From Swiss-Prot:
Result of knocking out the encoding gene: Cells lacking this gene produce antibiotic compounds (vanillobiocin, isovanillobiocin and declovanillobiocin) with a methoxy instead of the dimethylallyl group at the position 3 of the 4-hydroxybenzoic acid moiety of clorobiocin.
Protein name: 4-hydroxyphenylpyruvate 3-dimethylallyltransferase
Purpose of the protein: Magnesium-independent aromatic prenyltransferase that catalyzes the irreversible transfer of a dimethylallyl group to 4-hydroxyphenylpyruvate to produce the ring A structure in the clorobiocin biosynthesis pathway. Clorobiocin is an aminocoumarin family antibiotic.
Subunit structure: Monomer.
SUPFAM superfamilies: Prenyltransferase-like
Keyword set, alphabetical order: Antibiotic biosynthesis, Prenyltransferase, Transferase
Pfam families referenced in this protein's UniProt entry, alphabetically: PTase_Orf2
Effect annotated for changing residue 154 to A/Q: Impaired prenyltransferase activity
Amino acid sequence: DQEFDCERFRADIRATAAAIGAPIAHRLTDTVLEAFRDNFAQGATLWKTTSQPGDQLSYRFFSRLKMDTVSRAIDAGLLDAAHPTLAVVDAWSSLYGGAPVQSGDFDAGRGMAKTWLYFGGLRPAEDILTVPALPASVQARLKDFLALGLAHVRFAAVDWRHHSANVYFRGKGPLDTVQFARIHALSGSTPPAAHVVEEVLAYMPEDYCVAITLDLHSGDIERVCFYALKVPKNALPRIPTRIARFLEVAPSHDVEECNVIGWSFGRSGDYVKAERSYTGNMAEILAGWNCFFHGEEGRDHDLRALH
C-alpha cells in the first residue's frame, strides 16, 4: 500500500541501488534511517539519481515535521560538527526569524549528501546571497543573477561533500533561446546544439525554475540545471537509458505518480537528473510550494507583480 513502512523502505533502497548499479553502505543507511525515521515517516520520501554511470542512488525526505535536521545529522554522526559550511546553513535557516524548513538528501553509499531549505516565499536573491556567512566572492555574484533577472530564490541546497550550494530561482518567463543561452553561459560549459536547447525549452513552465551551483569558497558557477516537474511517463523527453531504467525500476506508491527531469549543464560534463516519488505525496507538497507541473498554468502572479 501507499503508507510508509521502514522495514520495506530499507529493502527498497538496497533493491533500487542494486537495480541501477550504485553502491551501498548498509550500516550508514541503517543510521540515516534511524536518525530521521519520523521525518521520512511524516513527509514525502522520494528517489533521485543522474545519468552518470554508476552514480549514487539518492533518497530524500521533504519535511512536514519542522526541526533542526542539521543538529540531528551531527548527533547521529552523519555529519561533522567542524564542517565549515554549517555557518551558512545556520545563516539561511535563521532568516525571517526561523520561517524556513529543512529537508534531507542522502546517498545509498555515502550517507548525508545535502540539506535543503524551503524559504517559504519568493524571497529576494539579496536576502539569500548576502548573509555575512558567505564570502565576498559569493556575495559578489548577486549582481550577475539580478542582471539575468533572477530576483527570487525559493529553495537553496547546501551540498555537504563539495562545500557548494544550489540556488533555486524562478524566472519571469517564458524561456527563450537567449535567456537560456545567457544562463548556460554561467556554467562555462560548451554551448549545446540548437535542439538540446529547444527540447529543454519545450518542457518549461512559462515561469521557469533554474538551479545554479556555486562553490562556497571560490564563488564560481560550477553548473546550472533546468527543471520540468510531474512529467508523465507517456510524455517524457528523449532520456538516457540509465534514467529510463531508474524510472522503471524505482518504486512509487503515491496516488499521484510524479517524475522530475533536469538538465544539469556544467563544465566537467553535462548530465540528466531524475527524481521519483516513493511515499508521502510529493505532488501535494510541491503544489503547496507553488511549483508548476508539465503542461499547466506556468504563470506566476506574485512574481510579475514585483516586476
